[PDB]
Design a protein around this nucleic acid. Structure first.
Lengths: 233, 204, 125
RNA sequence: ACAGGUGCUGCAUGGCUGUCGUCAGCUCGUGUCGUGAGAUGUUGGGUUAAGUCCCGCAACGAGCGCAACCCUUGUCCUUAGUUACCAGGGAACUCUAAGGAUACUGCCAGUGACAAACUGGAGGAAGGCGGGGACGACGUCAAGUCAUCAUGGCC
């Protein structure tokens, strides 16, 4: 899992990039060439950067550090949920609340409210309550769960943040910059690669590639976790 | 501009202080006797910290119930103080009357007590802002759900009177079942009279 | 011996329905004598004509309280009440008319500062 | 000593009150932005009696208003049946007065961003806030009151 094989990325379509007019000079070195008014990310640079990022994330999984997942895009969100559930790491997919980590202390009350609503659902509280009030309370439950559901078990600040579509997720990148916590991101041609510790220059507009990258990251984290268990026994 | 919370709350979620039945003609004198007793008792017990008083007069003997933060001094040593107050209260009124005292679990929760404290603070020239902040903080520590304090007048000896209010907690005035406690007291500061308003919301 | 109660904006009336000649007596007196208004007579006979049963059943009426034109409506509502208690099927058609609906309009409060329920002192410049 | 003053100062004040206005508004913590006054939230697409709720959105939440709670009728039920009521001396009905029952867009069909909502229909006494009242947010007018009462100063 530490090494990401070359051919599969080409099959996934990572190499495809955005149109020339929206091209960003800073990316330039990563883009080998442009064909038919479409930029092409170079295979070698992305493979090498992905290898480094996989090594770093496996290193964190060895020490049990918690890495956040951000899946805002409609395509990214569902796969992020599935992969994060297996990884055991927190994720947010439907929407990214402004200042989540910077104002996490305020978000503590909302997270606790979600947990206690889940508890009162578990313990059968609905029967005592009226039907209409039970329904409205359950609707508030669902609305809170969609936003905070993944991060509710984080119980802290993530040591590392994994993000896709850096251009759309720029706000979280600013929050991570202010905190100083490492951020690993997939940056497509248009997206700005600044203010990120690790750059993975990959296309994010393709469902198949997004699935490939998230799967690789989750596999690395998982293998780090079993390696951690081996030391305990 | 704002209705007295207690008056509106009497209807549903509160019990009237005075609960006695009398005929039309008897009513006029009975009410006046009750008001005289309340005023004299307030003047006599002003030094002590006292909450609102619940008075019930049946035919003949009257019965009085007083709740105060400090029961010990009002009782005196072996009831001596209360016995003297009772003899005077018998003299002013008719058939011998009986008065009983009920201890208060918490003085901060009761609205009157905090306002009396703030009035004494203003009389002793403690800064009004300090008085409001400490009075409000004590309630939050005690566990009262909400407390609000408003001061009107020439605070600090200012030529122009100004009104300063401080809130900490939900204090829904318009919720009739909020059972909010309101008392009004006046502080006799040398420069000018200062009006102190205290709102305490313990819940439903 | 079906019985029912109908009211109109003050009055209560009690109606008794049974088979018979169909003569109608109001407050121990003839209906036509009791009511001096053709409109009120028409309100009293409004429901029976609708389904063509004017004389089918004997009617016994006592109506205290309220006024001349409210008592007629109360009698009508009571007749409908007894008829609906008698027969389930009539209820839908009588509902289509709406005579089975108790009147909710009553003389409202005079709001202080207003001469009447809503009349306000005019001001002239 | 003083008491006393409906003598002055409402432009020194407390308390009370009118007013914009029962208009839907006024803000606060934290987070973010700007050197800064400050901005965001509170804007925007829909919706409402409403900052009413809904969906998006660097905002996340809270307060205080709105709404709710309370009073009064409008159908029905229980309780008691006199000084009321008598349908046939009775307690059935009316009424009187202390409690509950109902109404909640609950249900059917639609229009609707698969949403809040709205449009019509059944039933019901009552349908969308069923009608009325009470409740008057931060503040605006140095707005009215020293002649309810209270108090600073002045006489």
């Amino acid at each position: 899992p530490t090494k990401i094989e070359m051919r599969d990325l080409l099959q996934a379509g990572a190499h495809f990039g955005h149109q020339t007019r929206f091209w960003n000079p800073k990316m330039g070195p990563y883009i080998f060439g442009a064909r038919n008014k479409i930029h092409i990310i170079n295979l070698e640079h992305t493979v090498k950067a992905f290898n480094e990022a996989l090594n770093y994330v496996n290193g964190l999984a060895s020490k049990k550090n918690k890495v956040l997942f951000v899946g805002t895009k409609r395509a990214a969100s569902g796969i992020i949920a599935e992969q994060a559930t297996r990884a055991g790491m927190p994720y947010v997919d439907h929407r990214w609340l402004g200042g989540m980590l910077t104002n996490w202390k305020t978000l503590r009350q909302s997270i606790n409210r979600l947990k206690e609503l889940e508890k009162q659902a578990e313990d059968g509280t609905f029967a005592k309550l009226t039907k209409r009030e039970a329904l409205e309370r359950t609707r508030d439950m669902q609305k809170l769960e969609r936003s905070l559901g993944g991060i509710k078990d984080m119980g802290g600040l993530p040591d590392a943040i994994f993000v896709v579509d850096v251009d759309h997720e720029a706000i979280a990148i600013k929050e991570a910059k202010n905190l100083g916590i490492p951020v690993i991101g997939i940056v497509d041609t248009n997206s700005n690669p600044d203010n990120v510790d690790y750059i993975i220059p990959a296309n994010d507009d393709a469902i198949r590639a997004v699935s490939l990258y998230v799967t690789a990251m989750a596999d690395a984290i998982i293998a780090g976790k079993e390696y951690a268990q081996t030391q305990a026994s | 501009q704002k209705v007295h919370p207690i008056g509106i709350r009497l209807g549903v979620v509160k019990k009237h202080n005075a609960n006695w039945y009398a005929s039309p003609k008897q009513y006029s004198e009975y009410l006046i006797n009750d008001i005289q007793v309340r005023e004299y008792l307030r003047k006599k017990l002003d030094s002590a910290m006292i909450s609102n008083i619940m008075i019930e007069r049946p035919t003949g003997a009257a019965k009085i119930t007083i709740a105060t933060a400090r029961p010990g001094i009002v009782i005196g040593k072996k009831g001596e103080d209360i016995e003297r107050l009772q003899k005077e209260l018998t003299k002013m009124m008719g058939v011998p009357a009986q008065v009983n005292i009920e201890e208060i679990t918490s003085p901060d929760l009761d609205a009157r007590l905090v306002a009396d404290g703030i009035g004494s603070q203003l009389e002793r020239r403690v800064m009004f802002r300090r008085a409001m902040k400490r009075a409000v903080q004590n309630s939050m520590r005690s566990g009262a759900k909400g407390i609000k304090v408003e001061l009107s007048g020439r605070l600090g000896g200012a030529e122009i009177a100004r009104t300063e209010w401080y809130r900490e907690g939900r204090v829904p005035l318009h919720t009739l079942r909020a059972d909010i406690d309101y008392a009004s007291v006046r502080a006799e500061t040398t420069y000018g009279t200062i009006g102190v308003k205290v709102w305490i919301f313990r819940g439903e | 011996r079906n019985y029912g109660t109908g009211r109109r904006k003050t009055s209560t009336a009690r109606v008794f329905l049974a088979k018979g000649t169909g003569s109608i007596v109001v407050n121990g007196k003839p209906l036509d004598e009791y009511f001096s208004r053709e409109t009120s007579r028409m309100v009293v006979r409004q429901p029976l004509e609708l389904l063509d049963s004017p004389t089918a059943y004997d009617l016994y009426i006592t109506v205290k309280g309220g006024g001349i034109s409210g008592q007629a409506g109360a009698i009508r509502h009571g007749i409908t009440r007894a008829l609906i208690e008698l027969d389930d099927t009539n209820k839908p058609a009588l509902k289509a008319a709406g005579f089975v609906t108790r009147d909710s309009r009553q003389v409202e409060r005079k709001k202080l500062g207003l001469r009447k329920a809503r009349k306000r002192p005019q001001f002239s410049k």
